[PDB]
From a paper:
The canonical V. cholerae quorum sensing circuit is controlled by four histidine kinases CqsR, CqsS, LuxPQ, and VpsS. CqsR, however, is regulated by ethanolamine, which is produced by V. cholerae and the host. As anticipated based on sequence analysis, our structural studies confirmed that CqsRp is a double Cache domain, which is the most common extracellular ligand-binding domain in bacterial receptors, including, among others, histidine kinases, methyl-accepting chemotaxis proteins, phosphatases, cyclases, and phosphodiesterases. In V. cholerae, ethanolamine binding to the periplasmic domain of the receptor CqsR controls quorum sensing and infection site selectivity in the host.
Author numbering: 46 to 109, 118 to 127, 132 to 139, 145 to 234, 238 to 259
The structure:
Amino acid sequence: LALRAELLATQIREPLNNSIGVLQSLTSIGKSAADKEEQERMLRSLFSVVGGVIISGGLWPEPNRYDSLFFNKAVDQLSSWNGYDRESWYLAAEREAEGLYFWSPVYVDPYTRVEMITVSTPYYRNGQFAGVATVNLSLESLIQFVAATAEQYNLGVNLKDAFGVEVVSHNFDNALVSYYSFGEFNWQIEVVNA
């Protein structure tokens, strides 16, 4: 249960760290001093990754009016938002040190209509704040992945955000439990044998 929970956290940190990887690619594109055209070309490619936990995401430059490059995977570039400058995820990252990542709570996107978590980071150009990159992670994609991984280790699992919020619950009585906090983000798993 101990080592088995450690190997589960390892296998669950893969899509999360790869969410950071994509987000770092978004930041580089925002810092690239690129015209909107080429940017659309590259952002469609980056999201063209097959499957995964990411459902949508894009770039959100400082207003002044609005020029957000948002994309969703159903890939179709979205139109609305153009404001996003007053959105929780936007503000948490506005004019923050480049390289910091902010995980939002679980919420329902009004536009795309998906239960998700929004990780946000700022990108800079010429030592000036330029915008915010975001990556939206589908809760259903994260749930099926964690459920299939734990069940393959013959375990029940309860993963929680740093918010201590029940993100997923799978097969979780006199029983032993293992609490494993992992990652720069303060997520934890509660694991039993199933």
